[PDB]
């Protein structure tokens, strides 16, 4: 009733968007596509290890399930012919990370696709409250960027706008994700590092986030970095070390600039929080003023922002979805 | 060893498959000539070389044309979902170590035989009318004419030598088991759909106590016929990457027992498969051990009720303990 | 009567009882004792790894800290006999340090000027051990020291009671698979009680452990005294625990559903029921003292007998704490 | 030439130093001081969660303490200076309690009649700070109190030395992703040493934390004094850590392989080199003080000043311990 959504892939992101959508007025879910029975889908929506119990009546039917009395239709699998009989699709499989690949939901019936991942090809990449006003309403396929990109973009925008961003290096200390292995095991993408026991290791990994030029064109090329995946099930931290144009910067100046640009996607804190404190939060990024460092030898600037790589990213995606569907 | 050798093929190069491979390198004599799994050589070689719980493989692993070389010996590798296309006939495989978890059935494992392997040893409990073997409890029920054989489970290997002693020395009336078990690779990293419809095993493995069914106690009569139907129980999966505990609480015929008699009777049954300790150890102290079961004398108590009951507990490395037992049974079984 | 509560030892139970007492009209925490500064106390009340952010204003004022405008006095006095409890008109101390778990020893608080002590753990001596909604009406209000029992005892008692009342309990064996606690060690190190197993890295081991919950169940349910035994394994989850109980019942041909139904039918503010296949993290933050899991019910033959296994989840933190504050309020009301 | 050692504080570092010393010819332990009984000490030397079983006979036979037949004396004396050092046959006391991390404070061991103290931690006052194979040749044998630096400093120093010697170091930022340690708490709970972040459940959080390693690097490598800064994130692995370093260098046109090759060319027993894509648990038990990981080198170039990123692994237990025992042996040749 206002904005109708199909979710393809009822994984961590798919389920959290479902929950998120239940708290956002004007947005509904009408269909869910995944390869598993309804009972399993209902069960995994109801119970969440990190995010807690879904408050709300879930009960299973044949062609889907009921949530608070609203039926949701359930389907199965990828490409070839499943929506002929939606306002926007949330692509969540992690297997349409490409433009012509995600050109399949279009053929299938739905107006717009919001891809819950970075994607290749000729599409806009959107971080909400950094560059959503770039959306004009004619797009068929849109990337919602990554979790790390949504943590980094508002921070990078301020640094550039206020002090001039010359260059920067990032490290993200990142919760382990579902595409990592439980035990040491062959990995599908040939990543020898993600093949390892997720909850027992510090695992170095690549990330595309630092592709920031797709969200903030004016700093394209200026950033790089990577990830270290560690044994927390959700909640992550992005450290950013930069050279700035404006050479006489102080800790409080950077902190004040961050505070001044806060909004519902970009929070600010001066408390001495740890990763589990950000679990379930709805800012896409939470700037941590306690971690700001300026390094002078006659400057390098370091900053850190927290994000729940689940709910932070999800909240941002549902915001982009809503803005995409008021189109 | 060449044409000489007892040729082992490993199907499924997971935790059990790689550990079996390591054991076989150690033991020597028999040769892993082929490995099948659906991934490239570089991944296989890397995962053999580095191991989160079990430590660095000592010895040279290098990626060559047909597969990989371990300490100069070429191992052939294949990427094949259907095991009946496997070139077992061409390589004259003697035993396929079936470790994929997808062929845990007498009939199903026959695919390997069609492909040309003489014998299959399944690294898990299996249905139907096959022999289920715990080394040093019942490996001698084998005669060398079997084509498909089960190596039982990790839990069953921890339990059987304990149960045997209780029955032989005191008479087992009835008993309850709980195994607090390390999480396994078929469990999910994050909350997601499980491959076999299991809602519990569907949950984040490293963040939950997860109730789980095990056949170990009910199917103990496959290994120890004289106590068929006398045990039951289940499992809880918990956030340790390996290392497991079996608790067993039993009623004995002798109603005049002591902690000392029980511990003494366990002690005097020790072998390579059944260890004994008197130290208050924890799960991480059994990582990498090659006993199939380690009896922990510090946990024995004699309780009364209304009725004398006896509680005992045995540690196992559900990985290396099981694997050591499997390779013992494999060595015994290439034959006749 | 807004009854005045002092909390001694502002650890996991301490802080959680504080959060619960916010939702109880006519209980107000006026003092907190722990050996640390105000800033640390206020921070740890605000942020909680497993239980989530405290909603409401916490601010460090000069003499202690303010929660939603109400001042809470703080002290860091290691010797409980020295606390200014007379001076502050304390009715009841929630004794949560783990160092006064004895009737005579908890008397120190009475010495200090407090009227009653409720100990957040099993205790020895001449006092009552109370599991709310199983035996709290043993309290007549003349008690000066009371034990709130254990987390495990609270999970087990309503289950045991139903088995006994409806089927007759002959004997029973319990295992609790238990979250690791604060008195456990981060790394291998010496342990206060001399426990060589609690000495070990808590988040890296299955750790066998003694519990009195099954043996001392006769303190809470006299009619089954001596009928249960069992132990615990501490495992690497930060909170959320399970109690398995296997028993012999004085009733023939009992089905899984018949046991399940009798549990459901006894359900109240302390005893919940579920028919979903949940896991430990699903009970984090729940306020039932025990949650019966109908999906883990089995009826097995072991040799000419039927053994019935049941399982009950508890959040060894919030479940216990909810039970404790119920008992605290009941005691206050009398 | 058979160096005799007293270990004060039989914690992680103390026990590992004990073990390490059993593999090093010419060095032996004669006394251990900690506040706990022999049985607990023997038990914790025998079994180790991360480092594995101690091979070798440990017995509390006869209410004493024996390792492979050699008796080790144990004391339970919290008053360092009340220790029997002026009796007893010592060459060096290893101070591992974390409570004497100051030149004057560590003098208690000397007043007790001791001769030399080696502190297993950073320390204040007028003493030399030593990272073996970076600045040990600064030791002349006349020092009474010496600091063995930190785990992080030992991982960082050989990396920083090569960057400076070969490329010129202008400035640099460090982050160490660090295993949690035993002074961290198991459950959110007040920390005595009131760190609001180390107060939090160690195995369930990413915990930001200060380290002196970058700022105090000038104590080990004087020519780069003031050129480095950074901090730590404590994460849920029980041991094994990583140090990332991002630097501006003097030699502007540097490449990944050049930095890598320079690192390789400086390797020795304290400083290792790897080109495999390993993870933390692969360094558990290793005896290099620092292991350079060539797979993680990054050069960032936009036509300003180049940023170079490098990472070195360390087992914050055994790496540090191996370095400490090398410094112990060396101090004891001079």
Q: What are the structural domains of chain C? A: 1-149+317-334 (3.40.50.720), 150-316 (3.30.360.10)
Rg of chain B over Cα atoms, rounded to whole angstroms, equals 20
Q: Hunting for tokens 């809602």 — which residue is that?
A: B199
Cβ atoms within 10 Å of D75's Cβ, excluding its own: 16
Phi/psi for B148 (5° steps) reads -130, 130
Q: Given CA atoms D228, D233, D237, D239 in this order, what sign does their dihedral have?
A: positive
Own/partner long-range contacts of D36-40 (Cβ < 8 Å, ≥24 apart): D36/C190, D36/D10, D36/D76, D37/C194, D37/D76, D38/D63, D38/D64, D38/D65, D38/D74, D39/C196, D40/C190, D40/C191, D40/C194, D40/C196, D40/C199
Cβ neighbours of residue D284 under 8 Å, at least 6 residues apart?
A: D50, D51, D239, D240, D315, D318
Return d(Cα C119, Cα C102) in angstroms, integer.
9
Q: With contact defined as beta carbons under 8 Å apart, do C325 and B194 qualify?
A: no
Return d(Cα B49, Cα A196) in angstroms, integer.
12
Return d(Cα C236, Cα C281) in angstroms, integer.
12
- Least Cα distance to D66 among D54, D77, D76 occurs for D54
Q: Hunting for tokens 């982009």 — which residue is that?
A: A320
Angle (deg, nearest 10), helices B154-170 and B320-333: 80
Q: H or E stretch including C22?
A: helix C12-22
DSSP secondary structure string, C237-267? Answer: -SS-EEEEEEEEESSSS--HHHHHHHHHHT-
Return d(Cα C19, Cα A131) in angstroms, integer.
41
3-state secondary structure chain D: CCEEEEEECCCHHHHHHHHHHCCCCCEEEEEEECCCCHHHHHHHHHCCCCCCCCCCCEECHHHCCEECCEECEEECCCCHHHCCCCCCCCCEEEECCCCCCECCCCHHHHHCCCCCEEECCCCECCCCECCCCCCHHHCCCCCCEEECCCHHHHHHHHHHHHHHHHHCEEEEEEEEEEECCCCCCCCCCCCCCCCCCCCCCHHHCCEEECCCCCCCHHHCCHHHCCCEEEEEEEECCCCCEEEEEEEEECCCCCCHHHHHHHHHHCCCCCEEEECCCCCHHHHCCCCCCEEEEHHHCEEECCCCCCEEEEEEEECCCHHHHHHHHHHHHHHCCC
Q: What is the DSSP-derived secondary structure letter of residue A124?
A: E
Residues of A in contact with B185 (CB under 8 A): 181-183, 185
Q: With contact defined as beta carbons under 8 Å apart, do B239 and A233 qualify?
A: no
Residue C327 is assigned to a ligand binding site: no
Q: What is the DSSP-derived secondary structure letter of residue A151?
A: H
A232·D206 Cβ contact <8 A: yes
Strands A58-61 and C271-274: unpaired
Task: For residue A192, give how far its alpha carbon lies from the nearest alpha carbon of chain D (Å).
Answer: 7
The percent helix, strand, coil of chain C (3-state, each to 5) is 30, 30, 45
Return d(Cα A314, Cα A147) in angstroms, integer.
8
Return d(Cα B178, Cα C160) in angstroms, integer.
19
Q: What is the DSSP-derived secondary structure letter of residue A296?
A: -
Q: Hunting for tokens 């018949």 — which residue is that?
A: C258
Query: What does the block give as tokens for A217?
Result: 């064109």
Q: With contact defined as beta carbons under 8 Å apart, do B53 and B320 qualify?
A: no
List the single residue in C44, C184, C189 with the smallest CB-CB distance to D199: C44
Does the annotation mark B154 as catalytic? yes
Return d(Cα D152, Cα D229) in angstroms, integer.
12
Task: For residue C158, give how far its alpha carbon lies from the nearest alpha carbon of chain B (Å).
Answer: 21
Query: What does the block give as tokens for C24?
Result: 């109880």
Q: Hunting for tokens 């992080």 — which residue is that?
A: D152
Strands D228-235 and D169-179: parallel
Return d(Cα C4, Cα C27) in angstroms, integer.
6
Q: Given CA atoms A195, A198, A204, A207 in this order, what sign does their dihedral have?
A: positive
Strands D92-95 and D3-8: parallel
Q: Which residues on adjacent β-strands are paired with residue C20?
A: none
**B125 HSE (CA, 13 A, CB side):** 17
Cβ neighbours of residue B266 under 8 Å, at least 6 residues apart?
A: B162, B165, B276, B295, B297, B312
- Least Cα distance to A160 among A240, A96, A238 occurs for A240
Residues of A in contact with B197 (CB under 8 A): 36-37, 40
Phi/psi for B133 (5° steps) reads -115, 125
Angle (deg, nearest 10), helices C151-167 and C256-265: 110
**B147 HSE (CA, 13 A, CB side):** 14
Q: With contact defined as beta carbons under 8 Å apart, do C179 and C241 qualify?
A: yes
Phi/psi for B271 (5° steps) reads -155, -175
Residues of D identified as active-site: 151
Return d(Cα A119, Cα B1) in angstroms, integer.
51
Cβ neighbours of residue C210 under 8 Å, at least 6 residues apart?
A: C231, C232
Chain Cα centroid distance, residue B33: 22
Return d(Cα B70, Cα B45) in angstroms, integer.
9
Mutate to test the interface with D, among A269, A274, A293 (most CBs of D within 10 A): A274
- How many interface pairs between A and B have CB atoms less than 8 angstroms apart? 118
Whether the CB of A282 is below 8 Å from some CB of chain D: the reply is no
Query: What does the block give as tokens for D226?
Result: 């003031």
- Least Cα distance to A152 among A46, A224, A81, A67 occurs for A224
| Largest separation between any pair of C-alpha atoms in chain D | 72
3-state secondary structure B135-170: CCCCHHHCCCCCCEEECCCHHHHHHHHHHHHHHHHH
Return d(Cα D235, Cα D239) in angstroms, integer.
10
Return d(Cα A121, Cα C310) in angstroms, integer.
55
D199·C39 Cβ contact <8 A: no
- Least Cα distance to A219 among A145, A130, A325 occurs for A130
Q: Given CA atoms A155, A157, A160, A165 in this order, what sign does their dihedral have?
A: positive
3-state secondary structure D186-229: CCCCCCCCCCCCCCCCHHHCCEEECCCCCCCHHHCCHHHCCCEE
Query: What does the block give as tokens for D46?
Result: 């025998």
Whether the CB of D248 is below 8 Å from some CB of chain A: the reply is yes
Query: What does the block give as tokens for C12?
Result: 């996991």
- The CA-CA-CA angle for residues A258, A263, A269, to 5°, reads 50
Residue D20 is assigned to a ligand binding site: no
Q: With contact defined as beta carbons under 8 Å apart, do B202 and A44 qualify?
A: yes
Q: What is the DSSP-derived secondary structure letter of residue A161?
A: I
Query: In terms of DSSP H, where are the helices of chain B?
Result: 15-27, 41-49, 88-91, 110-114, 154-170, 259-267, 320-333
Q: What is residue C320's three-state secondary structure?
A: helix
Query: What does the block give as tokens for D113?
Result: 């009649």
- Resolution, expressed in angstroms to one decimal: 2.5
Return d(Cα A208, Cα C180) in angstroms, integer.
38
B284·C204 Cβ contact <8 A: yes
Return d(Cα B24, Cα B22) in angstroms, integer.
5
Return d(Cα C95, Cα C112) in angstroms, integer.
13
Angle (deg, nearest 10), helices A311-325 and A12-21: 60
Query: What does the block give as tokens for B90?
Result: 């061409």
DSSP secondary structure string, C39-86? Answer: HHHHHHHH--TTT-PPPS-EEEETTEEEETTEEEEEE--SSGGGS-TT
Residue C217 is assigned to a ligand binding site: no
End-to-end CA separation in angstroms for chain B: 20
């Amino acid at each position: 009733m206002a904005v109708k959504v199909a979710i393809n892939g009822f994984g961590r992101i798919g389920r959290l968007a479902f929950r998120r959508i239940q708290e956002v007025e004007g947005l509904e879910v009408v269909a869910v596509n995944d390869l598993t029975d309804d009972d399993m889908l209902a069960h995994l929506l109801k119970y969440d290890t990190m995010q807690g119990r879904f408050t709300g009546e879930v009960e299973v039917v044949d062609g889907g399930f009921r949530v608070n009395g609203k039926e949701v239709k359930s389907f199965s699998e990828p490409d070839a012919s499943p929506w002929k009989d939606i306002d926007v699709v949330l692509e969540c499989t992690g297997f349409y990370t490409d433009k012509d690949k995600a050109q399949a939901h279009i053929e299938a019936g739905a107006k717009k696709v919001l891809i819950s991942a970075p994607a290749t090809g000729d599409l806009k990449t959107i971080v909400f409250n950094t560059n959503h006003q770039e959306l004009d309403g004619s797009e068929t396929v849109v990337s919602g960027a990554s979790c790390t990109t949504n943590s980094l973009a508002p921070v990078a925008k301020v640094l550039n706008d206020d002090f001039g961003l010359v260059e920067g290096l990032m490290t993200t200390i990142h919760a382990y994700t579902g595409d990592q292995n439980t035990q040491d095991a062959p990995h599908r993408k040939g990543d020898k590092r993600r093949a390892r026991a997720a909850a027992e290791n510090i695992i170095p990994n690549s990330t595309g986030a630092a592709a920031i030029g797709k969200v903030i064109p004016e700093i394209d090329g200026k950033l790089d970095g990577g990830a270290q995946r560690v044994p927390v099930a959700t909640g992550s931290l992005t450290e950013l070390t930069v050279v700035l144009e404006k050479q006489d910067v102080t800790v409080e100046q950077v902190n004040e600039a961050m505070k001044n640009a806060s909004n519902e996607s970009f929070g600010y804190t001066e408390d001495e929080i740890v990763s589990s404190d950000v679990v379930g939060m709805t800012y896409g990024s939470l700037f941590d003023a306690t971690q700001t460092r300026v390094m002078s030898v006659g400057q390098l600037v370091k900053v850190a922002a927290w994000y729940d790589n689940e709910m932070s990213y999800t909240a941002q995606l549902v915001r982009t979805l809503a803005y995409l569907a008021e189109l």
